[PDB]
Design a protein around this ligand. Structure first.
Ligand code: HEM
Length: 152
């Protein structure tokens, strides 16, 4: 449950991401994969990436980063009214990709890390609070769908 002012902060922060969705998406995934190498194993199409240099050079990783952040941005712009947008992602990530909710926590924190890394001094405490709450809401609603599906 975010206030109007918190959603305003979220969407203000998101404008930073939308200016360079592929660069943000790439860095989010690289942060996820390098911080939590087990997550790489969930991607048949990225498990060949042995080094961060290879990850950085991967155009397909940037492409997927764009897909991920485009989806997330579409969800965030719903300001919590995202059941229709979230449902297929929860279902695909539980049933097809088999992504534990822990990895969604990892990527949520990776987003925060990337925002500070790319916008140092420009991702204020209020913005971090609002973005964190929005990612918690996202993760929590996914978690509810995971529970429905019995997925761990
Ligand atoms: C912000 C959180 C995430 C968003 C918005 C997101 C979004 C997406 C989207 C839109 C797709 C393609 C459509 C689909 O298959 O449903 C996808 C595919 C996929 N996602 Fe995610 N995802 C997120 C987090 C994760 C995490 C944390 C993992 C694993 C650690 C993961 C693993 C995968 C895999 C393996 C695929 C299939 C990739 C392929 O083979 O093309 N996702 N994701």
């Amino acid at each position: 449950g975010l206030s109007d002012g918190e959603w305003q902060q979220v969407l203000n922060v998101w404008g930073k991401v939308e200016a360079d969705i592929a660069g943000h998406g790439q860095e989010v995934l690289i942060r996820l994969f390098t911080g939590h190498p087990e997550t790489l194993e969930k991607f048949d199409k990225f498990k060949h990436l042995k080094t961060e240099a290879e990850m950085k050079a991967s155009e397909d990783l940037k492409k997927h980063g764009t897909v991920v952040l485009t989806a997330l941005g579409g969800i965030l712009k719903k300001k919590g009214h995202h059941e229709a947008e979230l449902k297929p992602l929860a279902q695909s990530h539980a049933t097809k990709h088999k992504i534990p909710i822990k990895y969604l926590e990892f990527i949520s924190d990776a987003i925060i890390h990337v925002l500070h890394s790319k916008h140092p001094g420009d991702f204020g405490a209020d913005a971090q609070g609002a973005m964190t709450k929005a990612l918690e809401l996202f993760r929590n609603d996914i978690a509810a769908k995971y529970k429905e599906l019995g997925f761990q």
